[PDB]
Amino acid sequence: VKTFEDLFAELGDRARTRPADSTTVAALDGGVHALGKKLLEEAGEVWLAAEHESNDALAEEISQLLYWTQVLMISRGLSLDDVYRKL
Amino acid sequence: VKTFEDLFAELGDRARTRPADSTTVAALDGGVHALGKKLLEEAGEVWLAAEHESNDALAEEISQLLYWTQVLMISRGLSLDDVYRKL
């Protein structure tokens, strides 16, 4: 993945076409409450790695946080531009 | 801002030139413990907005979470590639 926007396109595609094999689809189907839960937990994990783990370890956790953030966006029907206009 | 990548370049520029007027610069200087705390707190505010606020308010909180995520990246010396390669 080369951009934040490439990831979003890919996740949106999963949301649309609903591949049976997709953990993304399951997560969307699990609903917003569970998505917020996951996002928060991952924030904690990012903090843990920020203080105690290697760059590689932190990059991994940050990548997961970004993932859940975009899944959350999709579940509430937010576009990239909806967020991008606020940055 | 036309990207996550635009913002990251902007924040890197602030880290490089250290403009006196920037709250970003103060955040960088305070170190990683305060940054993780801010990130976790924002993750909470994202969850609050996901369950109980309008798309516009949610987009706002998400913009802030992404800001704090990038500031953390810059603090620890992670590149976009470092994160994206794990996506």
From Swiss-Prot, chains A, B:
Pathway: Amino-acid biosynthesis; L-histidine biosynthesis; L-histidine from 5-phospho-alpha-D-ribose 1-diphosphate: step 2/9. One of its GO terms (cellular component) is cytoplasm. It holds the Pfam family PRA-PH. The keyword Nucleotide-binding applies. It is an enzyme of class 3 (hydrolase). GO terms for biological process: L-histidine biosynthetic process; response to host iron concentration. It is found in: Cytoplasm. One of its GO terms (molecular function) is ATP binding. Keywords: Amino-acid biosynthesis, ATP-binding, Cytoplasm, Histidine biosynthesis, Hydrolase, Nucleotide-binding. CDD domains: NTP-PPase_HisE. Its EC number is 3.6.1.31. Gene3D superfamilies: MazG-like. It catalyses: 1-(5-phospho-beta-D-ribosyl)-ATP + H2O = 1-(5-phospho-beta-D-ribosyl)-5'-AMP + diphosphate + H(+). Belongs to the PRA-PH family. This is Phosphoribosyl-ATP pyrophosphatase.
